Amino acid sequence: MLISQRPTLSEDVLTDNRSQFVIEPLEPGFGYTLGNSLRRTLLSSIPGAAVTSIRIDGVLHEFTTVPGVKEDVTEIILNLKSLVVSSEEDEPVTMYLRKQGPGEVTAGDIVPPAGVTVHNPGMHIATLNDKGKLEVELVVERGRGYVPAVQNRASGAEIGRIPVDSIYSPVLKVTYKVDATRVEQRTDFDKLILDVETKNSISPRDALASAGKTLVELFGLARELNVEAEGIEIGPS
Amino acid sequence: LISQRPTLSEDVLTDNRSQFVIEPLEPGFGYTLGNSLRRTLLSSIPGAAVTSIRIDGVLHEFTTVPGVKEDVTEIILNLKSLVVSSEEDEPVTMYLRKQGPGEVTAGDIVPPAGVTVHNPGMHIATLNDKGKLEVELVVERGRGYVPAVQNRASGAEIGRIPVDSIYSPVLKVTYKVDATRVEQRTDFDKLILDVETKNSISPRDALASAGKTLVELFGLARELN
Amino acid sequence: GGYDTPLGITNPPIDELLDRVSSKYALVIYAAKRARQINDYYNQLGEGILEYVGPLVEPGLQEKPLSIALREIHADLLEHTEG
Amino acid sequence: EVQIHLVREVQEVYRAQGVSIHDKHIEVIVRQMLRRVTIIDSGSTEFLPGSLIDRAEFEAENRRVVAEGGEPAAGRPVLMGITKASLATDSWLSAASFQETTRVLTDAAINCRSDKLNGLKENVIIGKLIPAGTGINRYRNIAVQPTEEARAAA
Amino acid sequence: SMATGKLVDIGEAVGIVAAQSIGEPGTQLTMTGGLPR
Amino acid sequence: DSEAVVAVDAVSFTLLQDQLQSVLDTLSEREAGVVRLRFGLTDGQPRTLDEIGQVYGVTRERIRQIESKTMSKLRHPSRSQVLRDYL
Amino acid sequence: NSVPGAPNRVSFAKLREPLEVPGLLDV
Amino acid sequence: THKRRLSALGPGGLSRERAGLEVRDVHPSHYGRMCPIETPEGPNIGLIGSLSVYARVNPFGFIETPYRKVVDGVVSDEIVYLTADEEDRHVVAQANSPIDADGRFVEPRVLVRRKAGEVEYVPSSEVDYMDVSPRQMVSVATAMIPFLEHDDANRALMGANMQRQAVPLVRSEAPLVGTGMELRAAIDAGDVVVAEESGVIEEVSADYITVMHDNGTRRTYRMRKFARSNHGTCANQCPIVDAGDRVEAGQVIADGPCTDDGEMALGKNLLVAIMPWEGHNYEDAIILSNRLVEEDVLTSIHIEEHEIDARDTKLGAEEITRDIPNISDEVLADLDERGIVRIGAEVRDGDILVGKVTPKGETELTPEERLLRAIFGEKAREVRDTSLKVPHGESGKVIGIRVFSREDEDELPAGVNELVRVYVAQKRKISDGDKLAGRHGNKGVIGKILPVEDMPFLADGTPVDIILNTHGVPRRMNIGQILETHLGWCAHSGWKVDAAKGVPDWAARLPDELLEAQPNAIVSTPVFDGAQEAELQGLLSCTLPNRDGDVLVDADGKAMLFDGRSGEPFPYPVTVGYMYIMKLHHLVDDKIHARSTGPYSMITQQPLGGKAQFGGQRFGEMECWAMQAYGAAYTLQELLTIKSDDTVGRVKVYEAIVKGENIPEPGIPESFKVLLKELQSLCLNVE
Amino acid sequence: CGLPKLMALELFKPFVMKRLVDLNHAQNIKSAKRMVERQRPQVWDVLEEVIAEHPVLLNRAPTLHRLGIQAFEPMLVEGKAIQLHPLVCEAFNADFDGDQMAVHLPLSAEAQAEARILMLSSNNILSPASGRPLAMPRLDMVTGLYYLTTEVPGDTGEYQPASGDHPETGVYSSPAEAIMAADRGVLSVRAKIKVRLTQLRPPVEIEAELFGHSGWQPGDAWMAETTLGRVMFNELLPLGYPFVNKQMHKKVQAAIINDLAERYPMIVVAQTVDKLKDAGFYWATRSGVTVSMADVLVPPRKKEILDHYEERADKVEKQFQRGALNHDERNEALVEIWKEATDEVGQALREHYPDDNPIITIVDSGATGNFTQTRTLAGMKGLVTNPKGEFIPRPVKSSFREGLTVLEYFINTHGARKGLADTALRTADSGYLTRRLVDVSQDVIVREHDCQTERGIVVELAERAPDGTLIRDPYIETSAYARTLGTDAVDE
Ligand SMILES: [Mg+2]
Questions:
Q1: For chain C, what are the domain ranges?
Q2: What DSSP letter does each residue of I128-184 carry, written as one string?
Q3: How far apart are CA D34 and CA D55, in angstroms?
Q4: Which CATH number do you get for residue A223?
Q5: How far is the CA of H163 from the centre of ligand 1 (A)?
Q6: Which residues, other chains included, contact H289 with Cβ-Cβ below 8 Å and sequence gap of 6+?
Q7: Which chain I residue shows the shortest CA-CA distance from D7?
Q8: A3-13: b or e for each residue (b if 16 or more CB lie within 10 Å)?
Q9: In H34-147, where does DSSP find H-type helix?
Q10: Among candidate residues B122, B147, B167, the one where a domain is terminated
Q11: H or E stretch including A41?
Q12: Which of B167, B190, B217 marks a domain boundary?
């Protein structure tokens, strides 16, 4: 069919990584039809990397204590989890974080092996009391979406290694809503309004594009059943 | 990361319905994808339904035909149950003459070449001896429900009777996911979808049209950015 | 301060408007007389100029006069003296 | 004590039904009840004994009468109900719309009582703008002209 | 003034407001011990 | 009251008068003066042919000639598309 | 029952009321 | 129910105000005589009652009542019509008393109604009169409320008053659950053509039925097809038999407006949830599936009667014809050659239903008008134009015209020549604003008509039709709606009590032929003798599946609704069920109204009054108080001067708006000037 | 305000006539009038531009108090119903049982100014009677936020700190990760967790502790153990506002909105109220407050309680039969026994319902309905009034879930109809009182910024306690609050 009007994606750009997309107008009502799907696709369909298992010498059994530092183990852990780091190896790569003497360890202090690339080198991770030794090993594999603390597949994977959560999604928060643009001459067409806020690994402009490509591939499965099936053709780009 | 993209196999149950199993998917994504397809299928699948009829002995919708058991508005509601699928966009017109005592099924509708009724056994009206029913039906491609296009807004004569339209091959749709989500995080959904068209076009035919509409709309935000 | 943006009828924020008039009533008559002046301005463009000045801020495409008056009041482009 | 009694005794009811009414509203009402005084002794100053008059106007009459020879009229407070207080207003134009329009209007005629149109019920009736809200001259006669600095620009 | 939160302005017909506020919740006055009181 | 002002008719009548003045003054001076003095559009009284002649010093025939010429002139779709919706 | 063109509406009533409802327009 | 009405007010009777609070009460002698539930909830409570189901008027004008005289604890059948007095002398039992299958009671002690209405336990030796049956204390309407004894009297009253306001739908489905009264009080309504003498159908149509009696003589029942009711509702009667069938005497043979197969049917059976969905069903509102609008499940016909006459005036004679003053041909296209419209022509607000012209005489023209007439060369046409234009906000086909004529010798009032009435009809869909309401008082204007896809659907994709709110259920004490909902789901899906090992305990005293019940099978729980709660649970636990292996409603009576809009499921199971809801006659189109300048009163110069004309809403004293309390002075002056009374103010303001100038300052109101002249007329010098 | 376009097109008809004669859609005024009469298509697009920024009023007879009239911004809507915003129904006293509103229209420039500044809705939050807020959330949204902010211990993914065999597994690196988790099936919205917030000003104590001066929130850091639900809630409130971390009961929400309205500008109070409304509905739906008759749980030991008190009242009646106590004595004795029985039944009932029972969730949250109504649903109706006013000594003994008997319902009807009739008479007399009051005090208007007197009454203000303390007087909020001191409060 003829779409009878053409939707548009007029991006607006808030603070650097919190762009706000809109779409309008839409047949009543496809707003919800694609909004929730696009939300899930953003939050849980874009490839990305994260830390998975960190290990801290000196912390063998008591998971809340660290010599020479201020923050206990849990503060170091939820510091590490917010470490935007992209990787291009489809396999778990280890990393090493060392810094002796008193001071303030930062993201730049981790010495990344080949392939990985931190995207926030100036990040406050912890502080060292007095000549402290902080020996850390990170494991940054890559996946999709969000995967909770993967418990040991074996009985004991490693006494030193301690698992964490893994925020694979380059998007961090997405929210939407719909409206009622031109209910009379446009006859109640809806207006989707996204709010993607991605970590500075990749911009929302590209995150939305990758999500769109994944969704169009996914519905390609449906469309490749009767190619000669009359659908609602939107018209020329 | 789960490196095997999804696949849409099919399970037939009858002619007018069938199950689609789509797997694997990302966790917590099966329900959303299912509702997406459902909202599409159930609201934007173009079909064909009668738009307006005109019976000889009647000037409007609020009277009765001499001989017919039902009255005109009853006939209207019964005709608003038909399932007929056109092929071109021009408003075709099917005919229905009938004389003498007898039941009047939709099978008695001689379609012009290009359309086809998919349930001739439908009841329409029961006549008596003196009954003469002679009605013209108009058929038209469309998508989704649309109310009675008024007469004065049109140029029709006094004889026409507008009728509501239900342009919808689909009849009922549901789904359910089977997320394994074992304690290894190798998790996936399995969107077992369920479709039941109203016999006008097969379920895979309808699902194709829905998927095509989606592949268009999501294409809007794909690379236009 | 940065709290959120109004929309439609509520812009400018009355809690910034009332920062300038003594009470709200004076704000109402203030906006009303300024709006009537602006309307006289638009109407008297038919004949020659007169001392009726205004608007001052660049008005919207099809924007009522009262909204222009309130936005000007918010911008400190007017003065009033109570009776 | 009578004020403190009326306020508290109404608040007793409105609390018992579980309701909030700030006391100042009831106070504004009661302050109308306690406006007038009775005239037990006219002295020799233009006052009918057993009659009712305003406390402020009573004070004014005595302020005048302490000069030109003293006969201070013996006044007493009266707590008169809301209805009788309303009916004995100053504006016959208002006082006629409350109760027994005919009776109030006829003796307003016999007094030849000029009204001044200061209330609200009068201005609302004769279309004149009400003396309240934005009707008072402090707000009703504002002047409004563009500040000189903006006039210079445009 | 109970409505604004600031000092009452200089035209508020507080008499009428008081009358209204007293006679409004009266309909909820379920009950001498009630509305006739 | 079936004998009251429809209240859109009054403003419509004012607009009628205004556009009518416009269209009449789209013509020469004598033409407008003849039309107005003929149809009382300025003093409310139809001034007859001879009176229009004496206020112009010409014959009744001159007056009727001028008015008939103006009458044929006014009857154009050009001069009439603006007016015709006022009836 | 007792009305011939009745649709068979099953009923939960435990009681057997002796009298039938009167001629509702008798009044 | 208008018949069978007792109204204590009237000539001779006591009036409204003069009637104190005493008579409004329910003295305990009203039992069995005047239903304590049904009554107008307005300012006439108590002053209008309806009779009990079984009551009967004493030849002197008293309200007798039946009882079963009992002797020795032996319940007889000698039905006695005890009056209002002699009931006191006796001691009156209860119908739901455990009779020992022979007239002997079972327990020794029995409830009884003593003289002044006090309740006691007497041993079974004093009891001499027992009730004929329960629901004796209840009127005709209230007997039709399922599960009445669970609802509070407030909401049951509201239900019995909203159950007389459903509008006869076009489809008229009977309800899954009811009482016994849906049939007897539907053939007694009169609006169901009843087979007079038992015979055989010979020929039918949608207009008449010709029953061949057993002996010779026949009969043809003329259906009423689309007769306007007294409130604008259709009154179709389609016949419900076939050409070979055999009807017994006293049988239903033609449905009425709200009858389905003879019995009452005041609405539809709509799948309903009880969750608060997205705030739209906020505080008694309702959200709807769009399926109701598509499939016309709620759709009333309406038939309005327009009427004009041609009078004999002094100046001449009014005349009905296409001849009209200045007017297009398009707006006179639908009329026939002689005025009146063509049967079938759709109309809209502002059409010419009857072209009717009257003479006007002469008026000194406006010279500008004369110039325009000259320039266009049009005549005067001294006939004034008063045609019958359809009023505001009405449309739909023109069913039929009924035309009268003095010439055709039909009698009319004097000074009249031709009285023409133009029956118009329109098929109102349901629509937000309309007032749906259950049978339990639970009412509420339609809040939003959701599309069908974004409606919380079951596991089978079956959407839900409406979505009531929960917060309206508890604090109104009308759990009759919930019990009806569960029993309706049971009546829908059909149950099969597994009598594998004897009969289950809850169904020990269920009637037989309720162990299994087919799908879509109607039931009926009469009012004070119906399904107990235990019976409901017992049914609901076995509620045989639909098409797959699917018991959609768990034993508690709820389900896992899938959200239609978002997509996820709801985290907690929601109640579903089939709740029978009517369509009250408070449609939006009968209420909406607007005015920007309309007619004006003659005597006072104010806008006219009421939706009949345009008119404008009252602006009483309380609103003046409110707009003063805000301190808004100018708006108050507006509303009292240049929208009501400033006679030269109105046209000035309309001019000011239309030209875009400033609204002028309002002049003195009109009512003040009139009041001033009245006072000066009373010899009161006002100056 | 919602507004039926078919009605707006008739209110604003002069305005639209002008605006579409200015545009060259119609040569004159007359054609535009007839065009509106026909409703040619572009008239709608003109109607939008004329309705922009032009406020309309909304009466609701009976106009009891000053908020009966309010002024909204009209925005077009399909249908023919004036869509009203749900937060103003408490002011209008307007449920949606069919009640009808009246749209007036302001015309003059001054009139529009009044309707825009004085009578707008978002500027009238607090009742003029007692300064409480009336945009405050209610029936649905109260339940919504209650369910959203409660804390369900033992729920999914809680803060379960136990090392030696695994890490804490309760902390979430921010509300962002928390929401990601909750979208997955890991965290429940209400499980007690330990987020690490950086966008919500912490409570007073933790603020003073970690930061001291003022942790200017903006970009800080700190960890507070709450639900995710409370985090999403405190994102509704403004930035500067402290964290809440409680269970958003209706009294708590009233207190929060009072704090806001008395310390922030009105344009922020309005937006926060609107946000609370949206979140309230959205979480109301996910609450699952439904009323199935399998959730009106009867107190399982109702029988024995009734039988005990029936023994008591039966011995009282037999004593009457002995003549030891007269008629009125036995009536009063039975009345007291059945009051005692109703109390015992209500006690048992309340102790029997779990704390997440819908019928009791609604009531405890303060959303609607007092416990008596739940007691009447399940349990006992207790005593029913006589038509005269006295209590019936019968008394009713069946909850509406059980269904009554004939006599029971007939006795209930007395109280019901007496209630309705008295409601009619009472609403008619309240108007009488109000009319008298507006008569008395119509001429009491503020006329001077200050009279500069020295007198003035003295208010109680939390009388001393015997043990020695300042117990706050109960009714201070109405006599003490919102006043101006005459003298100077001195200490020690
Ligand atoms: Mg209501």
A1: 1-83
A2: TTTS-BSSS--HHHHHHHHHHH---TT-TT------SSS----EESSHHHHHHHHHT
A3: 9
A4: 3.30.1360.10
A5: 18
A6: H449, H450, H452, H455, H463, H464, H465, H466
A7: I479
A8: eebebebebee
A9: 86-89
A10: B167
A11: helix A31-45
A12: B167
Judge whether I451 is annotated as a binding position. yes
Domain of residue B75, CATH code: 2.170.120.12
Q: Distance from D101 to chain C by nearest Cα, in Å? A: 35
Of H631, H634, H662, the CB nearest to C39: H662
CA distance H622 to chain E (A): 9
Task: Please check whether residue C66 touches I, CB under 8 A.
Answer: yes
Residues, chain B: 225
Contact between residue I59 and residue H617 where contact means Cβ atoms under 8 Å apart: yes
d(CA F55, CA B37): 87
List, as ranges, residues 12-71 from F with C-beta within 8 Å of I.
Answer: 12, 15, 19
Rounded CA-CA distance H680/I42 in Å is 54
Residues 6+ apart with CB under 8 A from D134: C25, C28, C29, D140, E11, H631, H632, H633, H634, I110, I114
Are B213 and B113 members of one domain?
no
Q: How many CB pairs under 8 A join C and D?
A: 56
Tally: H helices and E strands in chain F: 4, 0
CA H251, chain centre distance (Å):
27
Q: At what angle do helices E14-23 and D23-33 cross, to 10 degrees?
A: 110
Distances (CA, A) of B100 to B53, B108, F7, H241, H424: 21, 13, 63, 19, 33
Confirm or deny that I89 is annotated as ligand binding. no
Tell me which residue of B121, H120, B47, F65 sits closest to I334, measured CA to CA: H120
Check B217 against A34: CB less than 8 A apart. yes
Number of domains in chain B: 2
Burial class (CB in 10 A: 0-12, 13-18, 19+), I3: buried
Q: How far apart are the first and last CA of chain I?
A: 56
* Calpha distance E20→H626 (Å, rounded): 8
Q: Is F82 on the interface with H (CB under 8 A)?
A: no
What are the φ/ψ torsions at residue A186 (nearest 5 degrees)? -95, -5
Chains B and F touching, counted as 3 or more CB pairs less than 8 Å apart: no
Instruction: Using a CB–CB cutoff of 8 Å, tell me whether F7 touches chain I.
Output: no
User: Tokens 């026994």 identify what position?
Assistant: I337
Task: Sheet containing H218-222: give its strands across.
Answer: H218-222, H208-213, H199-203, H246-247
Chains D and H touch (3+ CB pairs under 8 A): yes
Minimal C-alpha gap between H406 and chain I (Å):
35
Same domain, B51 and B144: yes
Give the method used: cryo-EM
What is the residue whose two structure tokens read 């009728």? Answer: B163
Q: Clarify whether residues A161 and A55 are in a common domain.
A: yes
Residue D124 sits at the chain H interface (C-beta within 8 Å): yes
Q: What separation, in Å, do the N-terminal and C-terminal C-alpha atoms of chain D show?
A: 64
Resolution in A: 3.5
Domain containing residue A107: 48-168
Those residues of chain E whose CB sits closer than 8 Å to some CB in chain H are: 9, 11-13, 16-17, 19-20
Shortest Cα–Cα distance, D46 to chain E (Å): 31
Measure in Å the smallest separation between the Cα of I183 and chain A Cα atoms: 9
Q: How far is it, in rounded angstroms, from Cα A183 to Cα H553?
A: 38
The residue among A42, A95, A27, A91 whose CA lies nearest residue A234 is A27
Ligand 1 center from residue I357 Cα (angstroms): 28
Strand-pairing partners, residue A200, are none
For H450, phi then psi, to 5°, come to -65, 155
- Has I491 been labeled as part of a binding site? no
For residue F4, the chain H residues in CB contact (below 8 A) are: 600
Ligand 1 centre to CA of B67 (Å) is 49
Which of these, H31, H66, H49, H454, lies nearest to H277 by C-alpha position?
Answer: H454
CB count, 10 Å around CB of I324? 11
